[PDB]
Amino acid sequence: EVQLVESGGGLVQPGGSLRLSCAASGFTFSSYAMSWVRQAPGKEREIVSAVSGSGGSTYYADSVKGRFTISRDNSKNTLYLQMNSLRAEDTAVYYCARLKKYAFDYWGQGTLVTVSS
Numbered sequence: 001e002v003q004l005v006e007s008g009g010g011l012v013q014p015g016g017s018l019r020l021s022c023a024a025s026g027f028t029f030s031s032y033a034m035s036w037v038r039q040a041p042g043k044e045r046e047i048v049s050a051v052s053g054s055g056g057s058t059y060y061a062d063s064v065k066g067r068f069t070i071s072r073d074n075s076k077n078t079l080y081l082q083m084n085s086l087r088a089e090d091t092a093v094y095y096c097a098r099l100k101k102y103a104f105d106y107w108g109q110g111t112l113v114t115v116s117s
Contacts, residue, residue: 002027005109006036006096008080011116017084018113020048021073022096029072029079030055033100036107037061037081039093046092048083048113052099061085088117 004027008020022029022036035050037059049070050059060068064085072079086092091114096107 002032002098002103002106003077004029004034004096004098004107006094006107006111007078007109008111010113012084012086012113013116014087014089015084016086016116017082018048018086019071019080019082020094020111020113021071021078021080022107023078025077027098027103028074030074032103033057033098034079034096034107035059035099036079036096037094038097039095039110039112041091041093041112043090043092046090046094048081048092048094050097050099051079083113086113086115088115091115
């Protein structure tokens with residue numbers, strides 16, 4: 001089966017950078033792809049990063065296609081996210097979620113990013 005649960009907690013003032021992650025165990029995270037994030041303080045969802053398929057597919061929020069990163073930790077039960085670009089004016093909340101068929105329908109806890117300031 002799949003094991004997991006978003007988590008981490010980091011700050012991201014304007015030009016900051018957060019460090020969160022998706023929990024995971026037997027299925028790991030990249031072995032079977034895994035996408036994640038999506039939520040916010042009445043700020044509508046907001047992804048941060050994902051890795052569909054072997055990884056050819058990758059996500060970075062909706063404005064950091066090149067300024068975000070789907071960091072991962074295979075033998076650590078989780079992958080992390082270095083997401084910098086916020087602006088002390090848009091705190092957010094995320095929720096992990098896989099997406100490769102046969103392994104899509106889990107990840108449901110709630111995490112976030114506090115633009116330090």
